[PDB]
Ligand binder design. Sequence first.
Ligand SMILES: C[C@@H](Nc1nc2c(c3cc(-c4cn[nH]c4)ccc13)C(=O)N=CC2=CCC1CC1)C(C)(C)C
Length: 279
Amino acid sequence: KKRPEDFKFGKILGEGSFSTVVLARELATSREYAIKILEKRHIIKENKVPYVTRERDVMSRLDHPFFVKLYFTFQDDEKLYFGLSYAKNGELLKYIRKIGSFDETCTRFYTAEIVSALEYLHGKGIIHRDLKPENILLNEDMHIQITDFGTAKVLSNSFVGTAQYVSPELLTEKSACKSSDLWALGCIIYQLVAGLPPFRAGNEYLIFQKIIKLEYDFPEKFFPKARDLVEKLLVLDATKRLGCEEMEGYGPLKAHPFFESVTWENLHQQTPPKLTAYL
Ligand SMILES: C[C@@H](Nc1nc2c(c3cc(-c4cn[nH]c4)ccc13)C(=O)N=CC2=CCC1CC1)C(C)(C)C
């Protein structure tokens, strides 16, 4: 039964559309948390409560090493607070920007960790819907910590994610499936190898046009096995993407030649490779 006074608020880690994530140290224990702060007035005013509820619902269901954990929640007169795990190393995007094109060892390790985390998520009947490097974080040990579930979809038509990673079905039919996250995974693998996402244009309208037309090109340098995987993920028909139900699930995706040498069991217990560039 914590309150804002139990913590000393430090540096701002990140900013959301209606939220701020701050590093906080618990006075009693000296333990660090990333506390997500939401102004109640703003959330009531902009009708943002269902997003707060969705993130609360989604996060309370997950218990996996590759996801940011929700520890506690409290509030005062003005603000609503969420005590989350601290991912010391920031966003995976920061390293994409810092180093550019990643080597094969690095690409394989990180792709495998994202594949492993998606399998968990999809097996729980949850679709992320906005999977991107900005919301794939890195903890002290350099292991992935996926976050940003306010816009996720629980299974038992609304939201459109970041334009570079949107699946064609989400644009056209307005409905996301688990396979929509596999499209984002293809975009992320390309980005790790190439240093840039596959669909690039002057504006969002022009990016969407390239998505629906499958208008992207591979650079010469691109790893042959990673290129094969990307071609098997960036497929217009969502029932023909490597990893989906219709395609026999995660097993054949984990079996893809790109993952040769990956021990799928306990990846979070394996030492990640030092992040190295490929020139
Ligand atoms: C994706 C997200 N960015 C971030 N969300 C979280 C971080 C985090 C840490 C750094 C970091 C570490 N060192 N320096 C920066 C940079 C960005 C972060 C953390 O440690 N623990 C929980 C988080 C998450 C929360 C959940 C509400 C989305 C946005 C911008 C939406 C706040």
